[PDB]
Design a protein around this ligand. Structure first.
Ligand SMILES: NC(=O)c1ccc[n+]([C@@H]2O[C@H](COP(=O)([O-])OP(=O)(O)OC[C@H]3O[C@@H](n4cnc5c(N)ncnc54)[C@H](O)[C@@H]3O)[C@@H](O)[C@H]2O)c1
Ligand SMILES: NC(=O)c1ccc[n+]([C@@H]2O[C@H](COP(=O)([O-])OP(=O)(O)OC[C@H]3O[C@@H](n4cnc5c(N)ncnc54)[C@H](O)[C@@H]3O)[C@@H](O)[C@H]2O)c1
Ligand SMILES: NC(=O)c1ccc[n+]([C@@H]2O[C@H](COP(=O)([O-])OP(=O)(O)OC[C@H]3O[C@@H](n4cnc5c(N)ncnc54)[C@H](O)[C@@H]3O)[C@@H](O)[C@H]2O)c1
Ligand SMILES: NC(=O)c1ccc[n+]([C@@H]2O[C@H](COP(=O)([O-])OP(=O)(O)OC[C@H]3O[C@@H](n4cnc5c(N)ncnc54)[C@H](O)[C@@H]3O)[C@@H](O)[C@H]2O)c1
Ligand SMILES: O=c1[nH]cnc2c1ncn2[C@@H]1O[C@H](CO)[C@@H](O)[C@H]1O
Ligand SMILES: O=c1[nH]cnc2c1ncn2[C@@H]1O[C@H](CO)[C@@H](O)[C@H]1O
Ligand SMILES: O=c1[nH]cnc2c1ncn2[C@@H]1O[C@H](CO)[C@@H](O)[C@H]1O
Ligand SMILES: O=c1[nH]cnc2c1ncn2[C@@H]1O[C@H](CO)[C@@H](O)[C@H]1O
Lengths: 421, 421, 421, 421
């Protein structure tokens, strides 16, 4: 309703509560605070314009204000129509961030707002899922030479960007922030493990313990979801298409079976494949009455909703973020968060300390593009490992943890080859 | 304020949303559904009057409607001023339950409303914390002879009632529902373990993994909170006064230390003692900046608020359910949910499937008083174990689990002595 | 071969290695060391004669030498023909303990040696499984009036003694050492959890992780076996006849099914029921090729060997403590330790620190009978809880652990009833 | 000493018991059985000569017999003097494998025997630790041109060989078997995790629950040892020099601290660094009386023995595989297995099912060298991932596990970029 040239938000008067959310989580993001203190002294982004597509909650807002405190002019659009937190977005507009996002946006508004954030003519694109980078190449080619580079936050976006590189139609360098150690080993695994179950408990008020929990995919996200489910008392069943990862899951104490077999016995289904149609018609037909389904991957195509809609004679909404599909035989299957990332739609996303480390890497990626975009080709690059090591050492210092250091004798010993028995 | 002779609630128009919540959780309470079916067929509480003091959310409402469906006239009052959900109690008033409760109500309203609930002149009293049973004994002795018996839901209430029995002031029989196997082994341990971290994550959006979590008390709630804290990645420290339970915690993999030593290193403190002043001035003086404190016990006297108030130079409110106490040296200590039951005040309480089991026991305890009050004494009794076994068997059938049965040969072997080596 | 009036052992020349085993574990039994220091100063067992039936390994030997250091004259027979460690027993004979035990004893030698230990005419009988107490009543009635009392170490023996009491034919008081908190919460649960898997790994050199482990019984032993199996990476399936314990196992994250269903899928079967014929013919007929079976209960009647012998066309012994039953269709099923307690026959029994606490209670039980046998009836008694608390406090002191103490205000608060909201 | 031109073993009569052990573990090695079947049908190593340096127990023997069954002439030498099992190597000599190994052999015999194994003039060298590959390069250059290539089994050996490649002294290609997915993710983590505690329990008979377990190194072995220590009830502390891995350990629930601080509080220390002098004088000076030390790394230089010797006033041997170092103040520190690979020297090594996977990779690496040596360079290569996938798929079939397969639609989606929101 408060919609103009410089922003489009639901209600500017929600800003006071948004500021409190941003201030609260920033108390627990020491790595990004450390970087912000530097950005304020050196203003490395003076004159630089930055367009961002991220999940617009209070940790994201602190990243954007950090970039703004480094002197950047910043625009923002939502990365998912339903992950936007309206009060936080109101606070970003009052701060001078050109943010275009209303929670519950239509698909068309999603793209209209993404285009409005692009109007800033960014030198740097910060993206989560690669929609903005894809949109620039497909509908806004008039500004590619202005773009120094982009960065991509999540696995599904990195896969899209690499296919763009393979097809030769990527036109500027992108940093695969998702591919950094301090990202996928912590965000994808520990962050999703906690916040997926946070979201599922919040939407349902159901018991995890003594449930058959079916985790589809045992990559970084899935093994984190499986680890925390087990930690909450569930019997965990893992579905994989990779035989090495299936054996890993067995060795971790989990049942491994295929999707039809898992569909007969699961109580709670969570998808984390990054793929399309992992759960479709013939799986829904086998599910027990009252089964709960949730998706943790980036796009809502992992649980195939049109198959659910075709099976159902009634579609009801008994709770916020719970869609009920009632089948011909009377069975009711429940889909959480409309099949979209359950941690960000039913809850508050990853915890503050996790996003601290991811978004610290995003800030260093943006600084990396600024400094090196002339040396880079239109390809997908990974940040140098020294940036991972810097982030880890700042985190450990803020926890009061001191680790052993290699002695010079040890350094020589590991580089040598004559010291056998 | 919508308050007639029959009810007193915040806002009757909220009732539609309370019904949805009640309908939702009831789909996942099979044991109580099974009991509700029989109560509707046989009407065993026809002409019986029941007054309840419970935490007034969804699952409590389904219990109260189950009793009413069995013929009972039911009155209800809050067990904690801040656990009440205003939309659920609006639905209960519309349904004919004489409920007197407003979220946030004053202590004076808490007791005024408890008296209004008692105006029904009950035959059975269902209590959570033993205030209502204590109130009849202190201010409403004119209806003691009408009361068949009471039932107590929680560990703190059972302790009070056995102290009343030891003192000779208990005037009618009391069923200690908390002492049933199907209660304290499931509700107190598995329920509290999950819902305590539900509430803490909900209030703070902070990471549990890699935190020092201090759990005070290693009784049934304490070991549940510890089990799930560990399941979520935390390093757990247990503080106990019972030496056997301290050893149990060690063997279970936890650090054990006293409260001063734990105060210096904890990031998150959770009390589960049912005692007074477990965490007090000298502990607050030792905690790290940004320590987070939560109480899982029934009364908010475990973390001693007045000592935080005396220590503080400012008291701020950065989030819902987060009080900030700022000390002279700039440290900020955070108290969740005002030091009250964090699972019920910052979240939705125990999961539906847990309360299904607890409240099935409450329904049966009410039936047990109806059928046995004429041959019970003014003492504290425990439900016969056949009822625990019935609740467990109904729950197992609803899960599709079929267990082995003792053969006659095995029963005779277990009662013999001549079959050694 | 070295067999006389005062002892019967395999080889006296093994004593030097037995002494080393006894000295080693005694370094890690501080509670029994504490008690031994007292026994040496007060000699409370001067003139007292003690007959013991225990598993004759090096922790048991230290208990017996502790009793001897208190001035007791001590005899000993094995509690299982196959748990005796010949070198330890040689060391006991050189110390003056009248020990009659050879590893691999026949059933008849087992009883002939048990009778020889009885020839001491004991005032106190220390028993594990209740064979000696049963033998005295059935074949050695000429010495009952000399016997002050007995104590019983394990669950299966306590069940036998209580049936003896119910039949009115128990003739002296017995202490149910197994029923003490510091016994079944630690020995039965944590001790058996570790040492069962110790024994199974040692006999087989097989991988626990990624196996279907079927635990029969979820009492104290079974839940300890299940907990450690899961900790070693196994998928754990629990078989129970108690619906409450079955639900507990579900809530702990384990699969629960009946024995036929478990027999089709288990890779490793462990029995811990204390019952007869939990695994019999129609379970063996469903087992996968190469299934491994082990028993942790006291008697070898839990896995019904005669059904295995009838099914097999060849019975082979591919490894020590592995019996191979080859079936008509070519399947091979492996029974460990001849179906006898796998932790004590395939390995070294419970770890030293666990037996420290159990055998400390056994020493205090013997001292309890000495001091109170005149006040006691021919019944089964449990040690007073103060002895449990003493043992726990000595253990905690030896670990360097200090616990919180209740303040006087807290003591009053927990005994009060007027402090509600 | 039974030593001809063709073998040198302790005692040929032990062979019957070695065969039983070999036959036993082979029943549980399905992947290697599958490969053995093909090797016998196709005889791909006919006329090929193979020299191996491995830990000579049962599973190693089945690998060597598998190679021989494929037509190979096989020689073998010990990878560690104290990991050799004299009965197994007796069976290998009887079978025609030219094995030169005695348990406890001197360092001079270790190298003499390695030279005897090399007297076969091998075409393929299979190594564990890279001594044999290092020995050919330093003392036996007269057969470098006959050698097709070598394979390295372990992390320490791969480090040495890549240092030889970086220095230009490597003269023939080398397969880093340790770097295969089906190796380091299973062998190094799950295998070492189980067999390290197998060996420690076997040597000490002490309780793991409620101990402070210090794990030095959080690589693949270290995190396996930590995972299973926690699974057995211990409080685990990780010591690392890598800051990312330190953070991983925290998030996994473990305390992280440096080695001096961990030295003061550990009860059990386990090194898994592959480095030198991780635990040294100043740490021994800080440890508690009765601390137990064990090494899981390939060379016994992680716990620095000479510093214990200088600190000690007595060195005693209270148990097999337990050295006692008594210090001036009476403290006794215990070193297990002489500081060598505790799983192999104090127990039976990794479980059969783990070595099945590792040694299946060795068999295929030997086949890979046979088929590709004419187009490889003097470099360190990793086996193609198709072989890892083949090993994992054979293992899954033998477990009865059927996993889902990527549809063609899913493969095309994973390679597209236009399908966003
Ligand atoms: N906050 C969040 O919810 C969050 C955080 C990080 C990543 N993600 C999203 O999660 C998804 C994956 O994250 P990752 O980092 O785990 O990817 P990853 O590639 O490590 O794991 C993907 C796994 O899915 C498996 N898989 C693919 N199709 C499958 C199928 N049909 N059945 C079973 N298994 C299948 C693959 O074998 C692979 O192991 C992506 O969409 C990523 O964007 C979400
Ligand atoms: N939040 C919920 O929904 C929920 C659920 C069940 C019970 N409860 C409440 O939780 C509390 C405990 O329930 P329980 O069933 O665990 O009781 P319990 O007696 O099982 O456990 C209490 C433990 O606290 C220990 N303790 C007492 N004072 C202590 C101190 N000063 N320092 C350290 N340890 C101390 C005691 O030794 C005892 O082991 C009660 O108030 C009960 O009503 C709350
Ligand atoms: N060192 C050891 O190996 C060791 C240590 C302590 C006790 N024990 C022995 O272990 C056995 C039990 O020990 P406890 O203390 O666990 O007994 P417990 O009674 O706590 O557990 C016994 C369980 O077995 C279950 N059960 C009985 N028959 C069953 C059946 N047919 N199928 C499935 N479950 C069945 C019962 O429901 C009960 O829960 C006894 O024989 C005891 O002597 C051995
Ligand atoms: N016992 C077995 O059967 C077995 C099995 C596999 C590997 N290994 C041996 O175990 C060792 C490690 O194997 P990996 O595969 O774990 O190696 P790796 O490199 O995965 O892990 C080594 C870790 O040690 C850490 N580290 C190095 N020096 C350290 C120090 N001074 N203090 C603390 N941490 C330190 C490094 O940071 C690294 O993370 C190697 O020697 C390998 O050959 C033994
Ligand atoms: O609370 C959050 N704020 C911002 N980004 C988040 C939060 N939680 C997860 N992600 C990010 O969302 C991506 C999936 O689209 C993941 O890569 C994750 O890093
Ligand atoms: O969601 C809930 N509804 C009703 N009661 C609850 C819920 N969660 C916990 N308790 C109950 O509160 C008592 C402590 O005062 C506990 O006994 C528990 O059974
Ligand atoms: O190492 C040991 N020494 C002596 N007794 C033991 C050991 N391990 C277990 N038990 C005891 O054996 C009983 C079963 O018959 C159990 O009660 C246990 O306490
Ligand atoms: O039982 C075994 N037999 C043969 N090799 C083994 C066994 N257990 C571990 N290793 C191997 O020893 C190497 C360290 O030197 C590890 O790489 C591991 O694969």
């Amino acid at each position: 309703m408060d919609c103009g040239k410089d922003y489009c938000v639901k209600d500017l008067s929600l800003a006071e509560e948004g500021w409190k959310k941003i201030d609260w989580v920033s108390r627990f993001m020491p790595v990004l605070q450390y970087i912000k203190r530097e950005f304020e002294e050196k203003k490395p982004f003076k004159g630089v314009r930055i367009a961002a597509t991220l999940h617009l909650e209070m940790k994201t807002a602190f990243l954007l204000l950090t970039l703004k405190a480094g002197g950047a002019e910043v625009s923002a659009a939502a990365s998912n129509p339903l992950s936007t937190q309206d009060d936080v977005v109101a606070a970003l507009a009052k701060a001078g961030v050109k943010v275009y996002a209303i929670r519950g946006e239509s698909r068309e508004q999603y793209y209209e707002f993404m285009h409005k954030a692009l109007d800033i003519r960014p030198n740097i694109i910060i993206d989560d899922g690669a929609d903005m980078i894809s949109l620039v190449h497909k509908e806004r080619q008039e500004m590619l030479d202005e773009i120094w580079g982009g960065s991509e936050e999540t696995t599904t976006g990195v896969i899209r960007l690499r296919a763009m590189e393979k097809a030769g139609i990527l036109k500027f360098p992108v940093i695969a922030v998702n591919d950094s150690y301090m990202k996928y080993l912590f965000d994808n695994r520990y962050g999703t493990g906690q916040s997926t179950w946070d979201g599922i408990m919040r939407a349902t008020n159901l018991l995890i313990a003594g449930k058959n929990v079916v985790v589809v995919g045992y990559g970084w996200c899935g093994r984190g979801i499986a680890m925390r489910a087990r930690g909450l008392g569930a019997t965990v069943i893992v579905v994989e298409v990779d035989p090495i990862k299936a054996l890993e899951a067995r060795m971790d104490g989990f049942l491994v079976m295929d999707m039809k077999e898992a569909a007969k016995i699961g109580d709670i289904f969570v998808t984390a494949t990054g793929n399309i149609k992992c759960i479709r018609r013939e799986h829904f037909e086998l599910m027990k009455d009252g089964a709960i389904m949730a998706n943790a991957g980036h796009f809502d195509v992992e649980i195939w909703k049109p198959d659910l809609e075709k099976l159902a004679v009634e579609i009801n909404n008994p709770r916020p973020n719970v869609t009920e599909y009632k089948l011909k035989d009377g069975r009711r299957l429940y889909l959480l968060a409309d099949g979209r990332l359950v941690n960000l739609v039913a809850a508050d996303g990853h915890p503050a300390e996790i996003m601290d480390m991811s978004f610290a890497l995003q800030a260093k990626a943006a600084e990396y593009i600024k400094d090196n975009h002339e040396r880079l080709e239109p390809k997908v690059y990974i940040l140098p490992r020294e940036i991972d090591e810097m982030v880890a050492r700042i985190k450990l210092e803020s926890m009061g943890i001191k680790i052993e250091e290699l002695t010079e004798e040890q350094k020589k010993y590991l580089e040598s080859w004559e010291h056998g028995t």
